[PDB]
Design a protein around this ligand. Structure first.
Ligand code: HEM
Ligand code: HEM
Ligand SMILES: Cc1cncn1-c1nccc(CCNCCCc2cccc(F)c2)n1
Ligand SMILES: Cc1cncn1-c1nccc(CCNCCCc2cccc(F)c2)n1
Ligand SMILES: C[C@H](O)[C@H](O)[C@H]1CNc2nc(N)[nH]c(=O)c2N1
Ligand SMILES: C[C@H](O)[C@H](O)[C@H]1CNc2nc(N)[nH]c(=O)c2N1
Ligand SMILES: [Zn+2]
Lengths: 404, 405
């Protein structure tokens, strides 16, 4: 029926009834659970039913369901689809839709903030150059001299029989990965492919471990264009450790603004192929995943040797000890630089509060346990002991294929 | 391409497909509309025979005699046995194969690399509570082997139609008492409050330490559970010290050497073994992180953090992370120093990756519960974190069963 949901630290029990509002299939079946997969394996009446549903959500949200404005707006959408095969959102609807998509993102531990989202309408964009302007303003607004603010910029929706607006980069700010033919990678190995694409479209590359990539922006059915971000827009933080004086000598640094730029935003059946969004980092993303993942910067050993740890055996927990100091360094360095950041304990604590708010407001909260639980110190955080139900609600952020 | 779940490792870039999940006969809790994978407990002669037939087929396949005369005869013999009695009985070597296959099939166990080397003690002749005690003692002695731990399971008589179950009431063969205090707090292990009060109701004279070993509550068919005290010499324990933090030994912490799950039901070919305790050896995080640091367990994080002089007033000091690491180190160090088998979370997950590759070759997949396979500290530091997994129920299986009270 409805999932009985238990917190094992407190003994408390809720029931998720919100999951019944799911109109889209995830990857699981009763025969096997596929909840740990990162990516999904893969007319007019369909659009119209998604359209009416969203419009209903919207007017419900402003406490005007049934109103004259509500019924009229349904007919507008209905008349537009019947004639054209599609329709258009009003800005206020778009602002709401973007917020709900964030709110519905089962993987996001930052959703306590969902009601506080600056939404830039960039639907009047006609060129890659214009996209760059918008993106530049997004970054300036979002960065705010280190007092980070959540923001999204929405570019023109997809249209039948026309190429998409796309930002080719996976993030607005990311470091290059230069493949040296001696097998290794200088920089971020996660970005080798995007770095190569940039070079091939005429970018002159560097040879550092932290070269900020240029943007590849694509207007419909046009080759993408290359744009170098003004260095004064890309706030970065030098990494140092509060006690380990040698740590700074590693030359490590990270950027302030995390901004996902390759996800698709779906509202009322409309799809926005370019809708980059930014918030602020939770520290483990940088300290654990970006810096310690074996397929990323992979600095664990370097730090562990500097700490004179025993790298010979697993049972000395050198990896665990190194990781902790690296995350400490990130938190310290960001705090010293007055750049917004949240540690995983604060983050998960606020998410629990969010789970509680959502239970009262909607009867549940879609959450992906494997992503909510931080990459270090799992059971040391409250979300570890909290059962979670995972499902797709719309509006939603989706993955979409790389445009190349 | 293929009509099977595609499984990816994101560290290595490699791809497999799970074909083994196609042999699953029992549904888990998920649907296309919502994933319940993170939930701890998710909610006739014909049914018996088809399950019996399945297991017999599995057995004969394993010894490469599928289709043989002996295979068809065993099939007919099981069928005729069920037809006259309503149940049937396993041959010893069938019981051995099934026990190992149940372990092999356990999606949550990171220790499955060892599945082939289980020692199976056949106790299907056991006819009393006193006798269960003897078998359990023998199990503990054999499995402990003075610190050089050996995997083992002891199998007691199956559920019989119109007969009471053999049940061990304790969740583990060795566990510490949890004494509810007048102030609302708990002396010992809070996990074990109920079982402690059940032992008292049944005549146990309770201690009052943080680490009092519980007596066993053993139940032979249609009889009241009887109380049995484990002789302390049989119960090997390890005092906890830290290799550089000299004060840690003064915390007076300890843990028992032998982990032995005693309240799970072993299901094979539709037969149900309601008492079949199994033991292995600990992965260090089980002790250092879960048992010692869980808020609702011993909860020693703050104490240790204070001893280390950390800033426990703010999350961003990572005082929890720091303490937790030192506690896990202490567990590993102490067990090594006492020469008691233990495996850290790195070694364990590496060995599990190897297991996954073995099983890919051997069966075309391996059912696995990501949330349980990933350790509770240092998650993405271990290789399994970056390994997608497919979770599904295969039989023979270990399954939860309601508490007998
Ligand atoms: C404001 C502070 C925020 C914090 C601290 C935060 C934190 C996180 C974290 C830790 C993840 C895990 C995924 C990963 O490891 O990359 C995540 C995922 C995600 N977040 Fe947030 N987030 C924030 C803001 C936002 C905003 C403003 C949006 C959109 C409007 C958003 C939407 C999403 C989505 C769609 C995912 C899933 C991405 C994927 O599946 O690859 N978050 N977030
Ligand atoms: C040999 C060394 C072994 C190691 C290191 C090991 C490790 C683990 C760990 C860490 C878990 C996580 C469950 C928890 O947190 O409580 C687990 C679960 C499990 N293990 Fe093992 N195990 C070993 C041997 C065995 C044996 C011999 C059996 C049975 C014959 C077994 C059957 C199971 C089962 C059924 C579960 C799931 C329990 C549940 O769902 O509550 N394991 N194992
Ligand atoms: C800006 C933001 C707000 N919330 C999270 N982020 C955020 N910031 C920075 C980075 C990310 C990563 C989001 N998930 C992306 C990784 C998932 C994958 C999907 C396909 C292929 C891959 F290699 C990896 N998220
Ligand atoms: C002996 C062994 C072999 N493999 C694992 N173990 C092992 N040893 C010692 C302990 C455990 C715990 C296994 N899972 C225990 C069940 C945890 C729960 C599940 C639901 C409700 C609860 F209160 C508690 N496993
Ligand atoms: C296989 C597994 O699902 C995958 O590695 C996930 C696990 N949890 C994660 N959690 C976060 N926050 N980010 C991630 O990229 C992942 N990766
Ligand atoms: C809520 C969550 O499912 C629960 O705490 C699970 C998560 N993973 C686990 N993993 C292991 N190994 N042991 C556990 O008890 C749990 N508990
Ligand atoms: Zn699932």
């Amino acid at each position: 029926k409805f999932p009985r949901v238990k917190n094992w630290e407190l003994g408390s029990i809720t029931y998720d009834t919100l999951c019944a509002q799911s109109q889209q299939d995830g990857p699981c079946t009763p025969r096997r659970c596929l909840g740990s997969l990162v990516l999904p394996r893969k007319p007019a009446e369909q659009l119209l039913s998604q359209a009416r549903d969203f419009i209903n959500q919207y007017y419900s949200s402003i406490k005007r369901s049934g109103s004259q404005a509500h019924e009229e707006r349904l007919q507008e959408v209905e008349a537009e689809v019947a004639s054209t095969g599609t329709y258009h959102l009003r800005e206020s609807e778009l602002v709401f839709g973007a917020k709900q998509a964030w709110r519905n993102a089962p993987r996001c531990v930052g959703r306590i903030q969902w009601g506080k989202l600056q939404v830039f309408d960039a639907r009047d964009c006609s060129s890659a150059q214009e996209m760059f302007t918008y993106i530049c303003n997004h970054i300036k607004y979002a960065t705010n001299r280190g007092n980070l603010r959540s923001a999204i910029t929405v570019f023109p929706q997809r249209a039948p029989g026309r190429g998409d607006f796309r930002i080719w980069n996976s993030q607005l700010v990311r470091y290059a990965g230069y493949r040296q033919q001696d097998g290794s990678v200088r920089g971020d190995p996660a970005n080798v492919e995007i770095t190569e694409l940039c070079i091939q479209h005429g970018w002159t590359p560097g040879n550092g471990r932290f070269d900020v990539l240029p943007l590849l922006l694509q207007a419909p059915d046009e080759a993408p264009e290359l744009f170098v971000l003004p260095p004064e827009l890309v706030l970065e933080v030098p990494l140092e450790h509060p006690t380990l004086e040698w740590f700074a000598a590693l030359g490590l640094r990270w950027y302030a603004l995390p901004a996902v730029s390759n996800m698709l935003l779906e509202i009322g059946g409309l799809e926005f192929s370019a809708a980059p969004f930014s918030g602020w980092y939770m520290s483990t993303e940088i300290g654990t995943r970006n810096l310690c993942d074996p397929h990323r910067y992979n600095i664990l050993e370097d730090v562990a040797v500097c700490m004179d740890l025993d790298t010979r055996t697993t049972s000395s927990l050198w990896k665990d000890k190194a990781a902790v100091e690296i995350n400490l360094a990130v938190l310290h360095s960001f705090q010293l630089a007055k750049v917004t950041i949240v540690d995983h304990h604060a983050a998960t604590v606020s998410f629990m509060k969010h789970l509680d708010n959502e239970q009262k407001a909607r009867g549940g909260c879609p959450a992906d346990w494997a992503w909510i639980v931080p990459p270090i110190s799992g059971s040391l955080t409250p979300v570890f002991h909290q059962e979670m139900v995972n499902y797709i609600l719309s509006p939603a952020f989706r993955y979409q294929p790389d445009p190349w």
